């Protein structure tokens, strides 16, 4: 988390797809050892396909420059998230910001 940033850290850390930005908002079930499980609020939820969103976290693996790309959940269990919000911090990210 850069103490002196410019505020463009948020847009770069979201728009580069290294963090697990929530597709549909709602609460959470948080099995998470394997995947973040998000229960969807009813307004964003389709009539059929009852549906809860299960995000795959990419754990310790090889990047193209032999660095380590790793995602860690930054939301707890039973915590509201909105559409477009971040859920898992990628490499060099801290709560959706950009921490090189």
């Amino acid at each position: 988390k850069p103490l002196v940033g410019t505020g463009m850290e948020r847009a770069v850390a979201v728009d580069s797809g290294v963090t697990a930005v929530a597709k549909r908002g709602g609460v959470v079930q948080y099995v998470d050892a394997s995947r973040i499980v998000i229960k969807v609020n009813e307004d964003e939820m389709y009539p059929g396909e009852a549906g809860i969103d299960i995000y795959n976290l990419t754990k310790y693996t090889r990047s193209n420059q032999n660095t380590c790309i790793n995602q860690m959940p930054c939301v707890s269990l039973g915590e509201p998230v909105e559409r477009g919000d971040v859920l898992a911090d990628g490499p060099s990210t801290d709560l959706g910001e950009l921490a090189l």
Partner: protein, 230 residues
């Protein structure tokens, strides 16, 4: 030779960790000498116990993940490296942490023995989320000084240990911050004397008068090479 000798007159505990201590009376000019010498020794060479080997069940390496927890295993090893333990009799003990159920895993959940004292009952380690999840780690707490890291302790270890024991770096020194001040002493007949106000900040495990006594013995036994031989 009209010199004097100092004593530890008042030892105030501001908290359980951050605690000042006076020294009185010091001679003229000696204040910064003893303060800087006790600072260097008290930051470099104090003995304190720390976590060395962590043994979690159903684990392969430290870069895996586990069932039912928040922090990953590297996060658990970092939060265990921050632990503050205070053993009394032995110099190498093995603790046990067993806990199931939804909720955070404090340091107060370790099934203590008699001679180990965990002085931080709000140190968080894990965040167990599944009620069917369990975690049973067996920590090993040695005792030394300085900084001995995992790379050097990769071949240094003689006692052939079995494979599966994660190696945590050893931050042995329990002193983190120390500042001294040379005030003006309130001596009823002398005005050219001073006091030394050492302001320690410990890990909670070390007793400040004991730390000052040990640093003084270290300095005296180092200077005996100058005293006796030439």
């Amino acid at each position: 030779t009209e010199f004097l000798k100092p004593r530890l007159v008042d030892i105030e505990q501001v908290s359980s960790t951050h605690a000042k201590v006076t020294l009185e009376p010091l001679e003229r000019g000696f204040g910064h000498t003893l303060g800087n010498a006790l600072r260097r020794i008290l930051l470099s060479s104090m003995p304190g116990c720390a976590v060395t080997e962590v043994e979690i069940d159903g684990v392969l390496h430290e870069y895996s993940t586990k069932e039912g927890v928040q922090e990953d295993i590297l996060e658990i090893l970092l939060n265990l490296k921050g632990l503050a333990v205070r053993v009394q009799g032995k110099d190498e003990v093995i603790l046990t942490l067993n806990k199931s159920g939804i909720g955070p895993v404090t340091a107060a959940d370790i099934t203590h023995d008699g001679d180990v004292e965990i002085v931080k009952p709000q140190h968080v380690i894990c965040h167990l989320t599944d009620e069917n999840a369990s975690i049973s780690m067996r920590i090993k707490v040695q005792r030394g000084r300085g900084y001995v890291p995992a790379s050097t302790r990769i071949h240094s270890e003689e006692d052939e240990r079995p494979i599966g024991r994660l190696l945590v770096d050893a931050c042995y020194s329990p002193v983190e911050r120390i500042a001294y001040n040379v005030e003006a002493a309130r001596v009823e007949q002398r005005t050219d004397l001073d006091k030394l106000v050492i302001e320690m900040e410990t890990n909670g495990t070390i007793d400040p008068e004991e730390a000052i006594r040990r640093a003084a013995t270290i300095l005296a036994e180092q200077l005996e090479a100058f005293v006796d031989l030439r």
